[PDB]
Structure 1
Amino acid sequence: ESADLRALAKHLYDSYIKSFPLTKAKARAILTGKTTDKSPFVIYDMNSLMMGEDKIKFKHITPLQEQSKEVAIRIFQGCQFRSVEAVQEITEYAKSIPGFVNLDLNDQVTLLKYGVHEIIYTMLASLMNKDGVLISEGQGFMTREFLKSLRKPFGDFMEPKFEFAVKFNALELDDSDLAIFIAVIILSGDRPGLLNVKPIEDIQDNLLQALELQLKLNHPESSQLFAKLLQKMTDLRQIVTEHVQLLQVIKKTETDMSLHPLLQEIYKDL
């Protein structure tokens, strides 16, 4: 019954709204403008970064970075901080997915551990455009050029994410669409170490059925969007792989720096 599917899509869309502060609809409003109601502080260079805490609230540093916590290392940890935060928000969302809590406990933990990086980059696209990404609830905007101009190692971290986002965003999906896609990502029966794949693939198929009808009704003129969206999951696993090895190099040259137990434990070159 398409009613059961249209019911699942609304449920998911609702949990999605209650779990993620900044939505794509909202974020797009901020990136395009046409209003004064909400204009974020812009970081486009070293100096503008310092004022970061001047106008926004960051537990990072403002003054000299070289001698007291380098600039790149400080922006990196800010990314890490927001990430462990997003992980908790994704974990709560997963709980609203029909059937998720009923799965073996170890399976739930395995699905979140391997699916978190893929969902973060997916959702990150919602906050990106060709020239930059929104930060701290959308109160900020960090330039694509400023990021691409960081120290030897930290210089090529976000550029690949920007390359993916520009393409992903070309599909013009909205929150109701993304709410189901993220659910599909989480219920992946191919993660390493799963104990009972069946019930997981059973739920994903129900989510795939809901995603297809959603795209059919929401994008009548976008032929084969479903197929195209699934093809993007390939670029996500690639980005995540490339991210692991780039994260390793950081773990070899930046000894003074650390990696929170979050983006460490759920990390075994997954």
Structure 2
Amino acid sequence: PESADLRALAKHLYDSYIKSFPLTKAKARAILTGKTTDKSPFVIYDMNSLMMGEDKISKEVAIRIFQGCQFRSVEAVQEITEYAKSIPGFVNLDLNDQVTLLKYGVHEIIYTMLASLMNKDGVLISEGQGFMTREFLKSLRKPFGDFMEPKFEFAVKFNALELDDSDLAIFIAVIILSGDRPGLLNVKPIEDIQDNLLQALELQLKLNHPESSQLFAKLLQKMTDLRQIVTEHVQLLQVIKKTETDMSLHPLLQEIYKDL
């Protein structure tokens, strides 16, 4: 059946997702809820606890935190790249188009996965070794005080949909295979792959969330929402790189942010 094939694709993506991302939502929610068996994460809720944690997990704290997020982003880009390479048909696409899909899609994926590590009170850091409170993050001096708040707002709404890792693997794959990214040289093959992924996502949601009315439509809207989140983030970065000095940007991020 065409449906049977869609389930095999869904499973292939889930398995690849597990191989590519060390900290899954399943593992993360276990930590956030306490069910975890491992050692509890070190909580950073103020300047003093951040100092203590710099030992457990020159520049002012706000910059150190900001750049810490950037370094985590670099790590995430590499993980996402490995995942993209597992999506059937991806490595056979024009190499320049693969670069384009990642360049314009990684941040949307980063924010999708970050939600898996967040709750209304804070976010897991360094793969669950720490938990930084939302309260502390917005206490940072401007413009850093509102750096993550929009991501927390998105995550609370996104997490209310109760997706699991199996749903997420397909959701992320659909986003990466967006045929409308600027500068793509061969759109058709990307669209054909995405159309198949979309069919797999729809079936996945109907089977995994039988009572969740219009979940597919809602996810399509979250995809649009994520692009708006990235737009704002990019806008804030330019405000920072306009008022802050001596700050260094990781070359991988410099490449992604260029002409973006």
Return closer, same or farther for 1:91/1:34 CA change in 2, 3 Å cut-off: closer
Residues 224-246 of structure 1: per-residue CA shift (max 9 Å, x gap): 11111111112111110000010
Deviation by residue 1:83-102 (Cα, 9 ceiling, x = unmatched):
11110000010011000011
Instruction: Quote the RMSD (CA, aligned, Å).
Output: 0.9
Contact 1:44 1:142 in 2 (8 A): yes
Deviations 1:203-223 (A, max 9, x none): 000000000000111011111
Distance 1:135 1:121 in 2: 14
Offset at residue 252 of structure 1 (A): 1.1
Compute the displacement of 1:35 (Å). 5.0
State the secondary structure of the residue aligned to 2:257.
coil
Aligned residue number for residue 62 of structure 1: none
Residue-pair matches, total: 259
Runs of 4+ in 1 over 4 A off after TM superposition: none
Q: Do the aligned partners of 1:184 and 1:208 also contact (CA within 8 Å) in 2?
A: yes
Q: Give the drift of 1:254.
A: 1.4
- Measure, in 2, the Cα distance between the counterparts of 1:248 and 1:52: 30
Give me the whole-angstrom Cα distance separating, in 2, the residues matched to 1:18 and 1:34: 23
- Residues 72 and 269 (structure 1 numbering): CA distance in 2 closer, same or farther, change over 3 Å? farther
Per-residue deviation, residues 131-157 of structure 1 (Å, max 9, x unmatched): 000000111000000000001111110
Q: Is the 8 A contact 1:244 1:269 kept in 2?
A: no
- Identify which range, 32-41 or 218-227, moves more after superposition: 32-41
Q: Which runs of 5+ in 2 are unaligned?
A: none
Q: CA deviation at 1:69?
A: 0.8
Alignment partners' CA distance in 1, 2:198 and 2:170: 8
Q: Separation in 2 of the partners of 1:175 and 1:183?
A: 12
- Which residues of structure 1 form unaligned runs of 5+? 57-67
Q: Are 1:153 and 1:250, in contact at CA under 8 Å, matched by a contact in 2?
A: yes
- Evaluate the alpha carbon distance shift between residue 200 and residue 218 of structure 1 in structure 2; reply closer, same or farther with a 3 A threshold: same
- SS, match of residue 142 in structure 2: coil
| Equivalent-residue separation in structure 2 for 1:86 and 1:239 (angstroms) | 17
Tell me, in whole angstroms, the C-alpha distance in 2 between the residues paired with 1:219 and 1:149: 38
Tell me if structure 2 keeps the 8 A contact 1:148–1:155.
Answer: yes
Which range moved further: 32-41 or 181-190? 32-41
Q: 2:230 aligns with which of 240, 262, 267?
A: 240
TM-score, length-scaled by structure 2: 0.98
Cα displacement (A) at 1:38? 3.0
Between the aligned partners of 1:183 and 1:99, the Cα distance in structure 2 is 12
Q: 1:105-156 CA deviation, whole Å, 9 max, x = no partner?
A: 0000000000001000000000000000000011100000000000111111
Secondary structure of 1:16's partner? helix
Q: d(CA) in 1 for partners of 2:38 and 2:106?
A: 33
Q: Could you tell me which residue of structure 1 aligns to residue 164 of structure 2? A: 174
Q: 1:269 Cα shift? A: 5.2
Partner of 1:104: 94
User: Which whole-Å CA distance do the structure 2 matches of 1:225 and 1:239 have between them?
Assistant: 20
- 1-structure distance, mates of 2:41, 2:183: 43
Structure 2: distance between partners of 1:36 and 1:75: 28
Q: Pick closer, same or farther for the CA change 1:203–1:35 going to 2, 3 Å.
A: closer
Following superposition, the deviation at residue 37 of structure 1 comes to: 3.3
User: Do 1:188 and 1:204's aligned partners in 2 also have CA atoms closer than 8 Å?
Assistant: yes
